[PDB]
Write a protein that binds this ligand. Structure first.
Ligand code: GCP
Ligand code: MG
Ligand code: MG
Ligand code: MG
Ligand code: MG
Ligand code: MG
Ligand code: MG
Ligand code: MG
Ligand code: MG
Ligand code: MG
Ligand code: MG
Ligand code: MG
Ligand code: MG
Ligand code: MG
Ligand code: MG
Ligand code: MG
Ligand code: MG
Ligand code: MG
Ligand code: MG
Ligand code: MG
Ligand code: MG
Ligand code: MG
Ligand code: MG
Ligand code: MG
Ligand code: MG
Ligand code: MG
Ligand code: MG
Ligand code: MG
Ligand code: MG
Ligand code: MG
Ligand code: MG
Ligand code: MG
Ligand code: MG
Ligand code: MG
Ligand code: MG
Ligand code: MG
Ligand code: MG
Ligand code: MG
Ligand code: MG
Ligand code: MG
Ligand code: MG
Ligand code: MG
Ligand code: MG
Ligand code: MG
Ligand code: MG
Ligand code: MG
Ligand code: MG
Ligand code: MG
Ligand code: MG
Ligand code: MG
Ligand code: MG
Ligand code: MG
Ligand code: MG
Ligand code: MG
Ligand code: MG
Ligand code: MG
Ligand code: MG
Ligand code: MG
Ligand code: MG
Ligand code: MG
Ligand code: MG
Ligand code: MG
Ligand code: MG
Ligand code: MG
Ligand code: MG
Ligand code: MG
Ligand code: MG
Length: 197
RNA sequence: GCUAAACCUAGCCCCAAACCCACUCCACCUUACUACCAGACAACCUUAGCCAAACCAUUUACCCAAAUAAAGUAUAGGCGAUA
RNA sequence: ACCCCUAUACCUUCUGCAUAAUGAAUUAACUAGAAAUAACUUUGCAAGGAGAGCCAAAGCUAAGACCCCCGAAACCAGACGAGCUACCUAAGAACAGCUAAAAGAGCACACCCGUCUAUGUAGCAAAAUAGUGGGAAGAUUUAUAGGUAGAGGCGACAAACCUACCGAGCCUGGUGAUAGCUGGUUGUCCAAGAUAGAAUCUUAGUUCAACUUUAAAUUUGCCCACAGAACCCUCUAAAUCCCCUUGUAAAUUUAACUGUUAGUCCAAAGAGGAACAGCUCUUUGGACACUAGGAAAAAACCUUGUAGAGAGAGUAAAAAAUUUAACACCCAUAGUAGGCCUAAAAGCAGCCACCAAUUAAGAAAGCGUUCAAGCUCAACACCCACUACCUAAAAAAUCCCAAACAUAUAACUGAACUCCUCACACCCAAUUGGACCAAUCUAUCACCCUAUAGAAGAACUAAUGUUAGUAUAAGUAACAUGAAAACAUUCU
RNA sequence: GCCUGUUUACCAAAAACAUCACCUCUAGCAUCACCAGUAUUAGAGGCACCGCCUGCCCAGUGACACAUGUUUAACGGCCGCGGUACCCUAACCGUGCAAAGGUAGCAUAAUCACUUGUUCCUUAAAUAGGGACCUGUAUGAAUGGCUCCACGAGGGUUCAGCUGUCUCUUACUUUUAACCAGUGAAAUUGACCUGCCCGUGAAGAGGCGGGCAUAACACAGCAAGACGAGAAGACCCUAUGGAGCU
RNA sequence: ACCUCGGAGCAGAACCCAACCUCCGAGCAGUACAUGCUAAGACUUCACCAGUCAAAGCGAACCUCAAUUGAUCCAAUAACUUGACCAACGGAACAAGUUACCCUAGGGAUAACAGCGCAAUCCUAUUCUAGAGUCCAUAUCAACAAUAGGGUUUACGACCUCGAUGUUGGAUCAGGACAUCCCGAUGGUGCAGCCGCUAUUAAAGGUUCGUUUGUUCAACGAUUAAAGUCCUACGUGAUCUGAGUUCAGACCGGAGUAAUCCAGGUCGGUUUCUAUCUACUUUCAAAUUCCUCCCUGUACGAAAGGACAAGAGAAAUAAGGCCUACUUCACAAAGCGCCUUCCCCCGUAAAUGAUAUCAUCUCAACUUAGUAUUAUACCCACACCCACCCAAGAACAGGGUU
């Protein structure tokens, strides 16, 4: 039982058209985005700051949840969503809040929408683990999109150069993507262990 | 000592000289070796290519009037291999 | 006879083969250097030679001597093929039984095909057998005859079939096609004999250079001493060129040719790489592809070269030495719980200061304390071994690897090197030069097998070479005949 | 893949080829084919019954018209950047290019890779299988797109049934096999009087170096080695060597 | 990527010298028109072709630069002269792509698998004490560095092999190394006990069954004392499989006008050998491991929790045998059935005592744990042999025939 690695390339002939630092910076940006989604949304407490998700289609186009109205703080077991007496907006927010990933249990009675959430020591933790897994899958999808963009750029820049250099660059991009996948899996496992601990 | 080994002579080759052959009886172009019946149609045509030019694309002696010489000369030829 | 000491079969391709790189079971027979211009030698004649033609400022004529074999996929021309198979034409034949819904329907025989498995693989068979399968009244199968043929035929397109091997059939002919590629290239002995590169549809080849070989003319050839061979920045080496003597004996030029020109290791100066490789590329030198001795067997490391017999001798190179860590005994009272800073920080959290009491102890060098307290060390008192040659070792896979020996005087052993008696041409790849030579025929001799000359189908340990004989595998794989009997018959 | 059927005789029977259905193009015609036929016909083709459909383009090529044209069920093609409100998307706007900018449908597929895409069912365990989502940045409509009746020696998954496939093999018969009697091959063979360990060597030794072992000889098995035998590697490279095809 | 020419370094002081070695440049330009004609002697890019300098002489006034370039034939012209990025630049007058339908002659001169050389990469062991570990370098880890060892992996070289070294996994059989996963025995601990961490010694024995992917790798389920690493031509295909991976058919996406192709996916796709030589074909035997009860609910703690040691009993695997029960079966052979199975192993822990009058376990002389063995069980009768039988057996051999 013994693992194995590879090597790494760094020269100017590659930088003459494709910079290997831009893909690393984009991967680090995706890492930071996932870390922000983990440490900003739902951790242990609901928090009024976790309502920054995505809304449904309103007048052809999806918007946010906090930029439309405002979220105030009153009691630790109630989240009042005061708005501006708009008809379709309340129903849109109720529909966009209901199948999120965390069980909000909303009670709408006209304008004031309260979100009371107690504390569950098992089901809520499992729902949070599932939401973190969905966020990790979204980060993986974004990483795959970045990988496809980089591969399209490398395919656009390969006709006037040898095939060995293109193969080495493809192998290095695959190694970077594998390292990013390993880091995403490590973060997901740490978050799951913290939630189920 | 067994298997074995050995033989000369049938014939053949290259020339000279000289021009050379073919129904005993019957059968033999239809399914040849078939004795015996009505659409008769009928042949005349530049060789090519391998190969050499170190590839290959024009090109490359072979052609049927005795010898020797002129002479491998005049000539021809991606004026080149070569003729 | 064996036992004892020595010894890594041959050819070919290679830098290098015992290589586990190729070829070969053996025997007999057969099977591979054909020729010109120009040069050399020997005659003849001679400013002329020649038996017309042609050459000629010593030439002309004659003779001798000299340039291999087998092997492709391919191309073209003309014949021969549809008795197998692809399709078509003519006139035929076959399809039990059941359910039949009516049917390019269902189960299922005969028949056609061949999904899967197993046996077989020089087998029964150059495509089978046994089981299991699809179709089986149709776009079915099949008996006979005919037709479409290769720059093509045919094709429900598999680039499928066209007489067992069709990306283009087979036979004959051009054809002894060609091949820079592989393999082979047959008597004895002797001598000389290792190459800077350039060009190239060219790096698997060739030409010219370089080396080598033969035959000639001529005189200088090599080693070398004073002198000498710009510079500039920082250094600037081992060295190199020219070169009188001197030891030497070779060098230059002319004529005619082949062959080498796909190389390795070591020492040194370098470049690339990893200041890696039995790694790649230059330069200087050496060795090998040539004998022998040594380092275990070993190409390139050391000694050594010119050839034989000897049951003589002196020698060259030639045997690896190291074994390692001890350490001190004793005594610690005090201004003072030095000041600052710190809740506290007392010799030892952080700084400034580091004075000073007793014959001796630093305003504290290591710990230790939350702060203190306790442990030492630096200092007397006390005797005083040395109080230190610094450090500098490790494990892989079948089984360690000659046996051993610390103590009778430095010498001995050890080659194809050298000497000794004798005779001496008698140990390199490709290539070149030379002296001989068996069989055969012819001219003349010879007459129990030879001689002088001319000639050539003129020599086989080797080409998965051809034919024939016999071995090894091997007396091996494999192959047979149902039983009794009166040999009338009977039984399974 | 609609079905029956057809094919690589001798390693591939299939999802491949054909097939009824649909569509495009060509042709106004007499004696040897097509045809002793005449535009509801004949030939050259694509696709593949049926059911719903088959979106846009003649810029280029080709074809037809020679009136700059007509033709895509002809060859073929169906966009790019930025501003876009707390999140992936965005209705929207600005802008360039074009012939048009992928329409309906379906969808991680037999569909480059990322890919074990995400999720539910199935198993104790599911990179296997089935149902849902679409960044399919290389899906998509006679290069036909999508459902469906029947069928398939086509390719995958699976409930129940019990079968030596297995846990774990055992017994019996025949063939085979060993001996006896008869006949009697083939590949292979440099010569061999043909051992083991370590090391060396053209780098993997029965033949070399150092040790060990060692009377001769039949017969039956096994396959670790002889870099084992058949086929001058079929993979890689060279040849101013061939051939097929476009 | 490059193909021709020039300058510098490698190449330091006559000449020369390569590299897919390191840097610059060139395919021109500018001024006179004697940039006229002839002619000794020389240099020469290692050949040749080309290229370079030039005394004197006839005439006439009183050349810069470094490369700056192109042979023959042929064509234009009355002539003198002229004509190519013939740049593949010593230059064919004019010719591309694909072949997995492929063929031939060769090459280990040259690749893919193996072996071999190296160790860039990888792994491991020691040295210094930064820094973690509350203080505390060394219970444990280890930053920058240093010294060595190994040849699992990825690469490098092309040294044997292309007149063929069969290639990945899996099955059977395993041999070996220890750098030890478990069973044995010790030192230390940030060791109160159970679990643990680290180090030394120890290779006699063992190291599971299943789902998915063809997998070796990898994820998961249930276990176990453990489900160890590595080598053996990434062990073993003349013992077996071909699941993928190395053809000919075909489909999808893409590239290409097309043939055709993809280190893209998928369905299908012939595994031939009668053993000549070496080696071998019962070594006759001295097995391991888990679990249950007692101790004990004790030692230990504050409680939870919780041991060693001694003893007893049951098992599992492995080896060697057997047919009385059961079972396949039946005057036999077998397991699913039954019986038996016995010695250690050395790293340290301690007395006396010098070198060094203390002390000190001793590569000081010496004394203990400390050596199981100089182990015992099998088997060991030289010839009656036609023939018959046999629990003996291929033939042979062996036993009985009273
Ligand atoms: O409240 P509690 O949680 O139950 C503590 P408790 O019950 O302790 P107790 O009395 O149950 O004791 C526990 C064990 O102690 C044993 N014991 C008591 N007396 C004696 C023993 N054991 C002896 N060996 N010897 C005695 O004399 C009991 O057996 C029990 O098991 O108070
Ligand atoms: Mg030719
Ligand atoms: Mg030639
Ligand atoms: Mg040798
Ligand atoms: Mg050869
Ligand atoms: Mg060689
Ligand atoms: Mg040999
Ligand atoms: Mg060879
Ligand atoms: Mg042979
Ligand atoms: Mg016929
Ligand atoms: Mg029918
Ligand atoms: Mg039927
Ligand atoms: Mg047909
Ligand atoms: Mg086809
Ligand atoms: Mg020839
Ligand atoms: Mg000589
Ligand atoms: Mg060549
Ligand atoms: Mg070398
Ligand atoms: Mg104190
Ligand atoms: Mg001597
Ligand atoms: Mg001598
Ligand atoms: Mg002859
Ligand atoms: Mg002869
Ligand atoms: Mg002979
Ligand atoms: Mg042979
Ligand atoms: Mg022969
Ligand atoms: Mg017999
Ligand atoms: Mg035999
Ligand atoms: Mg037999
Ligand atoms: Mg019979
Ligand atoms: Mg079908
Ligand atoms: Mg077939
Ligand atoms: Mg057929
Ligand atoms: Mg078949
Ligand atoms: Mg079809
Ligand atoms: Mg359309
Ligand atoms: Mg895909
Ligand atoms: Mg399965
Ligand atoms: Mg069918
Ligand atoms: Mg060896
Ligand atoms: Mg041998
Ligand atoms: Mg072989
Ligand atoms: Mg060959
Ligand atoms: Mg060439
Ligand atoms: Mg050619
Ligand atoms: Mg040709
Ligand atoms: Mg042809
Ligand atoms: Mg010269
Ligand atoms: Mg002058
Ligand atoms: Mg050229
Ligand atoms: Mg050139
Ligand atoms: Mg194909
Ligand atoms: Mg094909
Ligand atoms: Mg070949
Ligand atoms: Mg080689
Ligand atoms: Mg290798
Ligand atoms: Mg610290
Ligand atoms: Mg080399
Ligand atoms: Mg080979
Ligand atoms: Mg061989
Ligand atoms: Mg150990
Ligand atoms: Mg293997
Ligand atoms: Mg084998
Ligand atoms: Mg099949
Ligand atoms: Mg086999
Ligand atoms: Mg042998
Ligand atoms: Mg208790």
């Amino acid at each position: 039982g013994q693992s194995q690695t590879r090597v790494n390339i760094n020269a100017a002939l590659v930088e003459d058209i494709i910079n290997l630092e831009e893909v690393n910076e984009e991967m680090k940006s995706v890492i930071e985005a996932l870390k922000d989604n983990f440490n900003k949304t739902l951790n242990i407490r609901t928090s009024p700051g976790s309502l920054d998700k995505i809304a449904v289609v309103t007048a052809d186009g999806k918007l946010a949840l906090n930029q439309i109205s405002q979220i105030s703080m009153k009691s630790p077991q109630l989240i009042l969503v005061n708005m501006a007496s708009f008809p379709e907006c309340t129903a849109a927010a109720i529909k966009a809040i209901r199948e999120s990933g965390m069980n909000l249990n909303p009670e709408v009675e006209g304008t004031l929408i309260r979100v009371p959430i107690p504390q569950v020591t098992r089901e809520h933790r499992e729902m949070l683990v599932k939401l973190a897994k969905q966020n990790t899958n979204k980060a993986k999808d974004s990483l795959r999109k970045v990988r496809t963009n980089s591969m399209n750029k490398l395919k656009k820049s390969k006709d006037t150069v040898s095939e060995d250099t293109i193969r080495l660059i493809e192998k290095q991009i695959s190694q970077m993507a594998d390292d990013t996948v390993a880091e995403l899996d490590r973060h997901l496992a740490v978050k799951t262990k913290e939630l189920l601990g």
